[PDB]
Amino acid sequence: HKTLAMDVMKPRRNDPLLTVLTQDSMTVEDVETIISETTYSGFPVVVSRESQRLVGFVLRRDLIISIENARKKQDGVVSTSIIYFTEHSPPLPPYTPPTLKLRNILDLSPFTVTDLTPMEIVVDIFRKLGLRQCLVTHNGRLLGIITKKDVLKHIAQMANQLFNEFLEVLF
Amino acid sequence: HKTLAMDVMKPRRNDPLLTVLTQDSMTVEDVETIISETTYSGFPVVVSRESQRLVGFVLRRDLIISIENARKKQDGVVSTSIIYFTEHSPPLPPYTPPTLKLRNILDLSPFTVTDLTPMEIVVDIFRKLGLRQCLVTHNGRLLGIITKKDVLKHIAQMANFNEFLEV
Ligand SMILES: Nc1ncnc2c1ncn2[C@@H]1O[C@H](COP(=O)(O)OP(=O)(O)O)[C@@H](O)[C@H]1O
Ligand SMILES: Nc1ncnc2c1ncn2[C@@H]1O[C@H](COP(=O)(O)OP(=O)(O)O)[C@@H](O)[C@H]1O
């Protein structure tokens, strides 16, 4: 039984869904509680929760800075302001507060890998491209994530032990 | 000003639509009239023309051998036989002919990149990973394709730009 990308990605079997953001429908408060409740380095950005179509990746570090920088300006941006990553602001009803565009802190080119891809190949892409993270997908829809550390844990489980597969690392 | 993946991908502006196979709705005849009318090394396989969501990539040379052998097998495969790349056949009307499963020659892990990826990065990936080709997407839907030789024609165009000098 060869180990694939789906065997190493999070979430694991029967754990809560990937913590994601939408490109269009989330407010400042939504992003604020997500940051408050989680300690993940970054978050995927999708078109919507039903589509799960990937748009990009965005860092916690960067989200915090952009949201604190928006409070201080005191120019109408409030807890109920819509955050968007598209090029234009979404169509919105009257009396609604100004919008927050965060497209300039979004990595519009995250690296991707299908769930069926072997870990032998994933480990090799991480080594050769110097990736911090990689997103796992199925038929164009997002499924999970692998981070550099996840790879490092996967390799160390091979080191002290099947030992031959560890040596393939040098090749 | 900054050259992107959508700048080099095919099809271009005055070029025809991407040549694609569906995973469920192409008959053996459709795929045969595609093999004779084109010279492409391979074909992206999607879920449907509506969705354009990627399922994998399949080579021409394999399609030919596979289809050749099946017409030669007698499991009664004919011209109106549906081909599929999923693990199981789709629902079929009462009086329809046998099918041809071509899953075992589908590459399920083709390399992909977004249409907004910088060309310097696509070239970098091409060199380090030794890719023969690379598929281009926009928000999870398939837009186009870049081949190893496309990348060589792009380098050429540059050499006539300080971007050519960091490769
Ligand atoms: N957004 C996320 N949703 C669910 N799991 C995640 C997410 N981001 C990372 N993970 C997983 O949770 C664990 C910790 O991730 P993180 O703290 O971001 O980096 P690290 O793996 O270096 O500690 C890893 O197994 C990682 O794959
Ligand atoms: N399946 C395809 N559908 C549409 N265009 C393709 C397809 N395959 C390749 N192309 C494009 O048309 C040309 C065909 O190239 P191909 O014969 O596949 O290999 P090469 O580019 O090395 O000659 C290239 O410019 C490529 O970008």
Side-chain angles (χ1 to χ4, degrees), chain B residues 70-87:
Chain B
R71 306 205 82 148
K72 215 171 189 170
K73 230 277 192 42
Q74 300 252 12
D75 337 7
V77 174
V78 292
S79 289
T80 56
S81 280
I82 263 76
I83 295 180
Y84 67 86
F85 295 89
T86 49
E87 187 91 71

Side-chain angles (χ1 to χ4, degrees), chain A residues 155-171:
Chain A
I155 306 174
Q157 195 156 195
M158 281 181 173
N160 37 71
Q161 198 72 201
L162 191 54
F163 179 83
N164 267 38
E165 291 191 18
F166 164 67
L167 300 175
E168 281 282 349
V169 158
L170 320 173
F171 298 76

Side-chain angles (χ1 to χ4, degrees), chain B residues 34-66:
Chain B
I34 275 183
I35 291 192
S36 66
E37 293 192 350
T38 70
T39 60
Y40 304 137
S41 297
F43 310 91
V45 184
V46 304
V47 184
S48 60
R49 303 177 179 283
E50 163 84 320
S51 69
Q52 289 287 319
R53 285 186 291 113
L54 222 218
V55 162
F57 192 72
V58 53
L59 290 188
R60 146 194 260 75
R61 105 263 267 246
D62 290 347
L63 280 179
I64 300 171
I65 298 185
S66 289

Side-chain angles (χ1 to χ4, degrees), chain A residues 23 47 53-55 103 108-114 116-118 121 124-125 128-129 138-141, chain B residues 23 47 53-55 103 108-118 124-125 128-129 138-141:
Chain A
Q23 68 161 179
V47 164
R53 264 109 65 30
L54 219 223
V55 169
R103 180 170 177 97
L108 293 145
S109 291
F111 198 79
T112 279
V113 148
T114 51
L116 288 169
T117 310
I121 290 171
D124 196 46
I125 296 170
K128 285 162 169 175
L129 295 182
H138 175 71
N139 294 338
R141 301 210 168 109
Chain B
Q23 63 159 207
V47 184
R53 285 186 291 113
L54 222 218
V55 162
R103 219 272 207 291
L108 298 160
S109 308
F111 292 94
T112 289
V113 91
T114 63
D115 59 344
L116 288 164
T117 301
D124 209 29
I125 293 166
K128 289 167 184 181
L129 292 195
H138 171 89
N139 288 349
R141 331 207 91 110

